[PDB]
Amino acid sequence: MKQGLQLRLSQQLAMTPQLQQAIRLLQLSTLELQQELQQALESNPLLELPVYQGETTQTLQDYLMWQVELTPFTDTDRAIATSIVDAVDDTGYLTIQIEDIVDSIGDDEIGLEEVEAVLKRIQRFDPVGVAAKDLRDCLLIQLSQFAKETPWLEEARLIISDHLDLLANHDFRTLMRVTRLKEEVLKEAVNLIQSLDPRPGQSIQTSEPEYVIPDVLVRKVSGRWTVELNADSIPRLKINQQYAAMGNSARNDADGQFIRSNLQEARWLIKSLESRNDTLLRVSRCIVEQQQAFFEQGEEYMKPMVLADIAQAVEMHESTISRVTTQKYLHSPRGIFELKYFFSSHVNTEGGGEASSTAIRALVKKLIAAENPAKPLSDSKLTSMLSEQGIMVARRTVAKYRESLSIPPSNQRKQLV
């Protein structure tokens, strides 16, 4: 023969189609895969205390109920108070409106005056501003709770009344122009207003751990990184040995055929599961080989990664890689992150560098965190930082990353030092 690249000849079809079982195996379903396996095992018959928590935390709902019971109120007043307690947000605000509350009361005798009186009684509770549903209202109640001997009290009340917009935009100059307040003397009042404990009802909420079960665990102790999947999380199916030892002995053709079909289906399913597990392990090993460079380089200097780049590291099609990456999580000493989180776009950099979008965002966030509070860093100013990094980037598109990190506008982030 010879070596060449002629482009006209006969050929055959591509990979044979209708591999539905393999397609499901390629996708990772985690507990959903476990549920499907349980359903199949239900279908396939040849496949196989004294200590109690006893905690009655009030959660401030019971505390509110006890306060209502301990407080003197009419039967209608008690019912209104209970209804108000029903519509309370976790942060401490009222979810429903006063008109909504009146409508839910559904009483002609019930009036807006009674609702206001109940709210004042509701305001007359610990913590102050209970179910205020308005930041100014809760702040006003909290300020009214304190004594008037404190300095900058009337000015703080006036600001909370109708000067909230300027503070929202941090419009100190506009606020000074409007309210005609003393310059730089209002900084103390602003700090005191910042010391108002927003969302006082948040203390009611108690922390609950988030049960996250990883799939792959990596140690890399003393180097020698070795990817190991969660053996406990690894599914395992058993063949019914008693059922296996009853197929040949069967004298009924129908029973024998059913046993053979069930055995074949179970064998195919077990083979598919083992192949999926092996493919996942190989993909994890390849990623860890890629992630080892990323882990050593750190989050700030994470290298860009491509789906095709990883598919090259393996022997399966990129479709299998994409399917396996779905619902994929792993554990590392640095932390636990999704497998798809590894991939990132490559940003052309000075000297031809390709910059990971995630790493670029992390570095930009670190730089923005280390910024002067009086003068927030500008997006155009971020071009200077990028040039200092020695790597080219898209400052115009960097605003997208900044918003992605939920970074407020630099002008909006401006505040008195």
């Binding site: 209970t82 209804s83 029903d86 519509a87 429903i96 839910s104």
Partner: protein, 49 residues
């Protein structure tokens, strides 16, 4: 709560609050109505026992 199992909704009664599983009809305004996407009586939690 799971579906048609132990510690499940639509059986054994409502959940910690009068709120329904589908997230709709979550208020004391509803006293005995049952939601559509999830079948839940809007009642107190203590009836679960």
């Amino acid at each position: 709560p799971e579906r048609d199992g132990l510690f499940c909704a639509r059986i054994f009664g409502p959940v910690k609050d009068y709120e329904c599983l589908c997230g709709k009809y979550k208020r004391l305004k509803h006293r005995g109505v049952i939601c559509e996407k999830c079948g839940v009586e809007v009642t107190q939690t203590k009836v679960r026992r």
